[PDB]
Design a protein around this nucleic acid. Structure first.
Ligand SMILES: CC(C)[C@H](N)C(=O)NS(=O)(=O)NC[C@H]1O[C@@H](n2cnc3c(N)ncnc32)[C@H](O)[C@@H]1O
Length: 862
RNA sequence: GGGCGGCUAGCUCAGCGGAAGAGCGCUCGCCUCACACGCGAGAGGUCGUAGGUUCAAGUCCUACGCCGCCCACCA
């Protein structure tokens, strides 16, 4: 230890960070010690980490460390996620911001550049976590696209397919013509945008009219019906007729359908299954054959599409499309409108739609496999309000498109016969085998799906792929049901649920026993922190400015009840300042036991007090950790250390130390140990440095959690008496306008036994000598247990003392009033505890007694 | 259209059935021999509104008001 005046994290953290980095806390399946498991949610290989991740891992670490030194086999599986779609976009940008882009350089040369990036980003992420003191079993670091994990998916898919659950068809898919790939619902964002709602109208067979309101005019040529609510009899004479479509000679039918909202536009809508999910739905509800007018490049093409209108852009197609309507006479009324325009969550461009042969996953069945558990009580949720939010999600699931036309992810394991057009999917038993002949036509010619999987598809395979489940390892046997899943609600759907499936379906058991959902950190502005918003702060920018133990402490302190966390640097100071206080407290004890000269070993009230107040602390804090309420523990230990140890105990001990008392110097050292223990999970660095200098131990992390010792009833009540006498006096001086160090005489009445037995402490703390005889005239301070009288010697600020006391009375009678009203209240007398009632009575007893002392003094004073 | 979270001291946030709290800021004193990233003494809240339950309500029930999320096929 190098005990300077102020604590410099930079002289401590880095050396320990490295010591822990180079020598991980490796897990042992045969440790024959109760395990505790946590799967770290793998950070996306896109850039660095931000304060969010920090909150996330900081919480995890604190649990790992606690559990570890609590007696378990702390297993925290680290790892990074390839991000798929994400990383893709990221590397593309780096490229273009150079000159060339994706297509510009093959599917190889590019797939290369992405890995180089996977290294930078994946590497940086690891440092960051190491520097934040992550005691993660880096021996088992995993990576979504490493051999051991790529096997987890490939097998997972195989079992799915050959099980039926994973199929291939042409359901409708949300497609982004930017990235050229299908997305999933959860992957697209519908952000309200100003547009135009056009009402077109056209010829009915025999009769003459039908009117429709569509945001996209171009999608008319691909119509297959006009839908009208079932009960909207305003169309009763149009129901079942026809409709030449504008510019066409195509005659669409007029059908009913519950999905038509009569009150929107005209009571009827156009139906275009090949270009929209609502129409596709209604479409395939009256069996309407799909038909497209625009291709994946987002351009015009099709049978219906009219000459000269086929070709150019999807939008530059509706402009000229409208003019050909009104000027042709079918465009009735156009008008502004705020449309719920769907865009690609990761590139912005508005998604299109298309029927494509893709890989889907019968979610309906799986989802229930999970609900079975939740329903039973298998999984626990911390905020707990998320149980429902989860279940209700699974309640209404929709077959998930697993395919992706991206160049990143896992090349799916499916082979297509260039002859009988059949799919060849390796079986479980030989999942690793690449078919060489079609099991349909027996042909040798085969072609493998060039698609890729959804990053979210592999990620749902984590509580398994980190334990080598592609196979059947010992890790997976020793610790599969994870103990607590830490993550922020932002991915409770695309991860937590997805994983609950893999777990209940591939293992028939909860992937984890408790799901811990913490809020999200967000810029001061109140909005979420994320690479996308461009509102991110590197955790290392903060660590270098306040220190890792600080950053860790802020973040935990603030993570209360799964609530979000608004960025407020003030909280980072809060933390730093506290580290420093903890530090100083330690410096004092270290510098104290310096050249100490033992001269007695006498138990001191102050000692017996802090020991007791400590058990109280250990008990409380443990239970808090036991309830996964770290944020609370954080402020409960702040309390202990600062307000009970530094503010009162250390001070109360200085005289005894000058007096060369060993029992005290001892107690200080012992109490400081336990405290360093308690604080460790949150502030690991400083807490270790200190503990080593204090006891020689080089790995506090491995020490055992403290157990509450005794608890001294009287002692605690005795020392409170003291605290009061001391504060009374220093409150008097304050009011009198007397300087702090000013020598002073005082007289005490009441529970004074404590002050008498521990004179020197009283003196040292109040800076006052005790008067044997009560002074006639004097300034008075009335405290609950004790009362203080200060002689009128010197120049005192009576106006102040007056005001202050004229104000305590204004309050003591007020308190007496409330109590009276209670005690004499209907029902309160007996309908309340035989305790809260007799005590609320002992409040009245003394609120008066004090009000009296003050009243008398207050008036007595000339 | 549904759900949810928030609304407590100037600011940022805890508390969530029995006498209103923290950090910072502010006022007054202090370089008191661990700490000025500090010490001591104070000021500052009818706990978003309207009801209701209960001996007892920021703390529970009920509508509502704003701020923000998530989910949904109003073309
Ligand atoms: C499979 C998933 C783990 C995926 N690779 C992924 O979620 N990758 S990530 O970079 O977004 N990291 C997400 C994890 O970090 C948390 N997180 C991300 N942003 C924040 C934030 N602003 N506040 C609090 N927590 C946040 C998520 O809870 C998740 O654990």
């Amino acid at each position: 230890m190098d005990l300077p005046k102020a604590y410099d994290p930079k002289s401590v953290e880095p050396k320990w960070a490295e010591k822990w980095a180079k020598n991980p806390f490796v897990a042992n399946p045969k440790s024959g010690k109760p395990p505790f498991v946590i799967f770290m949610p793998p950070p996306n290989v896109t850039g660095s980490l931000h304060m969010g991740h920090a909150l996330d891992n900081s919480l995890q670490d604190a649990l790992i460390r606690y559990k570890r030194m609590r007696g378990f086999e702390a297993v925290w599986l680290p790892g990074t996620d390839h991000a798929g779609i994400a990383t893709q976009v990221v590397v593309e940008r780096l490229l273009l911001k150079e000159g060339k882009t994706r297509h510009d350089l093959g599917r190889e040369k590019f797939l290369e550049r992405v890995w180089q990036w996977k290294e930078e980003s994946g590497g940086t992420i690891l440092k960051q976590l190491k520097r934040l003191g992550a005691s993660a079993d880096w021996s088992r670091e995993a990576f979504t696209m490493d051999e051991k994990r790529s096997r987890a998916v490939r097998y997972a898919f195989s079992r799915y397919y050959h099980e039926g659950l994973a199929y291939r068809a042409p359901r409708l898919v949300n497609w982004c013509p930017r990235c050229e790939t299908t997305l999933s619902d959860l992957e697209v964002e519908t952000e309200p945008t100003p547009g135009k709602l056009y009402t077109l109208r056209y010829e009915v067979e025999g009769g003459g009219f039908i009117e429709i309101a569509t945001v996209r005019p171009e999608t008319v040529f691909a119509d297959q019906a006009i839908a009208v609510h079932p009960e909207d009899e305003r169309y009763r004479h149009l129901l079942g007729k026809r409709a030449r479509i504008p510019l066409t000679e195509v005659w669409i039918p007029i059908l009913a359908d519950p999905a038509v909202e009569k009150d929107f536009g005209t009571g009827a809508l156009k139906v275009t299954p090949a270009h929209d999910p609502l129409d596709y739905e209604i479409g395939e509800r009256h069996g309407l054959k799909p038909v497209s007018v625009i291709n994946l490049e987002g351009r015009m093409e099709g049978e219906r599409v009219p000459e000269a209108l086929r070709g150019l852009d999807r939008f530059e197609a509706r402009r000229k499309a409208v003019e050909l309507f009104r000027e042709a006479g079918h465009l009735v009324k156009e008008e502004d409108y705020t449309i719920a325009l769907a865009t690609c969550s990761r590139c912005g461009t508005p998604i299109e739609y298309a029927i494509f042969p893709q890989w889907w996953l019968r979610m309906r069945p799986l989802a229930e496999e999970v609900l079975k558990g939740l329903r039973r009580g298998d999984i626990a949720f911390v905020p707990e309000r998320w149980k429902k939010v989860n279940m209700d999600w699974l309640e209404n699931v929709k077959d998930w498109n697993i395919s992706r036309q991206l160049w990143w992810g896992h090349q799916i394991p499916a082979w297509y016969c260039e002859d009988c057009q059949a799919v060849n999917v390796p079986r479980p038993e030989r999942y690793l085998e690449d078919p060489t002949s079609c099991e349909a036509c027996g042909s040798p010619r085969l072609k493998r799906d060039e698609d890729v999987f959804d990053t979210w598809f592999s990620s749902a395979l984590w509580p398994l792929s980190t334990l080598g489940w592609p196979e059947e390892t010992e890790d997976l046997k020793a610790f599969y049901p994870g103990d607590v899943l830490v993550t922020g609600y932002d991915i409770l759907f695309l991860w937590v649920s997805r994983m609950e499936v893999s777990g209940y379906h591939f293992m028939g058991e909860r992937p984890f026993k408790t799901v811990l959902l913490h809020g999200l950190v967000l810029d001061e502005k109140g909005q979420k922190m994320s690479k996308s918003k461009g509102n991110v702060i590197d955790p290392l920018e903060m660590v270098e400015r306040y220190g890792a133990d600080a950053l860790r402490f802020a973040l935990i302190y603030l993570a209360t009840g799964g609530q979000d966390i608004r960025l407020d640097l003030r909280w980072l100071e809060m933390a730093r300042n506290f580290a420093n206080k903890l530090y100083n407290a330690a410096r004092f004890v270290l510098l104290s036991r310096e050249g100490f000269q033992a001269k007695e070993d006498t138990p001191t009230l102050a000692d017996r007090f802090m020991r007791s107040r400590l058990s109280r602390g250990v008990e409380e804090i443990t239970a808090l950790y036991e309830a996964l309420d770290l944020a609370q523990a954080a402020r409960e230990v702040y309390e202990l250390v600062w307000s009970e140890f530094c503010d009162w105990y250390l001070e109360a001990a200085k005289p005894a130390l000058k007096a060369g008392n060993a029992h005290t110097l001892r107690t200080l050292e012992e109490v400081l140990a336990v405290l360093l223990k308690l604080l460790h999970p949150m502030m690991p660095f400083l807490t270790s440095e200190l503990y080593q200098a204090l006891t020689g131990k080089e790995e506090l992390a491995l020490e055992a959690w403290p157990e509450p010792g005794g608890r001294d009833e009287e002692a605690e009540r005795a020392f409170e008496a003291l605290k009061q006498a001391v504060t009374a006096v220093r409150a008097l001086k304050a009011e009198a306008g007397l300087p702090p160090a000013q020598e002073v005489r005082v007289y005490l009445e009441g529970e004074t036994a404590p002050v008498e037995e521990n004179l020197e402490v009283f003196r040292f703390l109040s800076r006052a000598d005790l008067l044997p005889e009560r002074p006639a005239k004097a300034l008075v301070k009335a405290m609950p247990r004790v009362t203080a009288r200060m002689p009128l010697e010197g120049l005192l600020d009576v106006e102040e003392w007056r005001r202050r006391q004229e104000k305590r009375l204004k309050e003591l009678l007020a308190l007496a009033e409330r109590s009276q009203r209670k005690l004499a209240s209907p029902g309160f007398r007996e309908k309340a505890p035989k305790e809260v009632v007799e005590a609320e009575e002992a409040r009245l007893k003394e609120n008066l007694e004090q009000a009296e002392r003050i009243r008398e003094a207050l008036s007595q004073i000339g």
